[PDB]
Amino acid sequence: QESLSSWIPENIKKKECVYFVESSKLSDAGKVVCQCGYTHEQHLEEATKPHTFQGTQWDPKKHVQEMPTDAFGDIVFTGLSQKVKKYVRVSQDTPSSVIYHLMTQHWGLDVPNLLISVTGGAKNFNMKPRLKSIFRRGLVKVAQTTGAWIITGGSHTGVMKQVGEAVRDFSLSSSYKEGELITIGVATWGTVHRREGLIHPTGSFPAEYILDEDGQGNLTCLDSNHSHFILVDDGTHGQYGVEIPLRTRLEKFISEQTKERGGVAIKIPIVCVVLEGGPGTLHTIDNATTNGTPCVVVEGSGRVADVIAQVANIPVSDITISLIQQKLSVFFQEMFETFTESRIVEWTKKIQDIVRRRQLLTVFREGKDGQQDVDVAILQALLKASRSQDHFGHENWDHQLKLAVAWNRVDIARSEIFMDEWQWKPSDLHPTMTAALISNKPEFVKLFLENGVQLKEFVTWDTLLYLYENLDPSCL
């Protein structure tokens, strides 16, 4: 709390609208709203000055200014639980290295073995109890047994509301390590209901927040079940397209990072899941899939996800544009008349690509086939895409085994890894056997010793010296 309040404002900075454009459009009995949309007669609430040369109109570049952030601390959501949750306020141009350093060192989070991403539509939706319990149990189990980050949105409506709901469901029992399902949230600062009770310079420590639904306009309220929030600035009042670019950049930079524990190094795997999105999910799914993320679309209660599920295993290019139009004309009653003849083309092309690559794309099949606890389905799709990656020198085998040992699920190791891909001379399992012994994993050492590694070998002078160096650093 002493070295944290220092490492925030003089490196992280916030955007503001210096220039004083008047109101071209006045909306909802307000004249203070001027283009960007903050208060005061000018565009923003800053000093009413000519602001250098009085060039007509403003440019999101010429007239957006970056100054040090003044809002940060530990948000407490009134009487709705006493947990104290961190929050910071950032802008467009902050390199992902700064946020990663803050989140790993200053905030106290640990580097995850998996980055599960939750992106979905924001129109409120209601779904059947069976699929509801399946999703909750699967998400909580896969995100608790691997110590993964659950980065998602910070709103209180939609899929992110569902994941807040699932985190609450976990905290209901909380058999051990209740505060371990850390869920960083990403949302726009410019659209928050009670955000004026958070602007306090040089430390807004326990700044109480009040949430009130059906008291806003189009703006959004914060959630109460998440663990961390990162809010982005643009010096704008009612836009929703600023969190997605930064979130994609940060999520890409996270997977670049490598975790090295026990002597085996892996780059953090990165998975995506979607639930009934809208127009922007066909951004996020494409943007994720082109990179190589195992996007996992779920069949059931879907405006967009159900479309991929329906057109999923039907082979590529066997679908016509008119066929896609008639597919879309049976699911979108509210706006079935406001769909332009060009809106079909974008969706046709993107569905074409996504469904064309079925190695990366994976359909859940809620209850038909593969209807497990979702955790193993996500892990199975992730290892499918990892198997689909490039490998020249028998590297897929070792990488998949290293990743399985990095997690703590032996069922995956025996039912996907150790059953298939041939070869695996017993000397090959030695490097990961060391990590299994070091991290105290008895199930994996039993399995490896079953496959053929002999305790008569593998205990070398060098190996013993290595093991004694990495002895448990809490021992007499």
Binding site: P315, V316, S317, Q371
Partner: peptide, 19 residues
């Protein structure tokens, strides 16, 4: 016996163009 009955409860509950 308790472990054997659980999986059984689970079982009863579950049941190209070239351009």
């Amino acid at each position: 016996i308790s472990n054997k009955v659980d999986a059984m409860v689970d079982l009863l509950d579950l049941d190209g163009d070239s351009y």
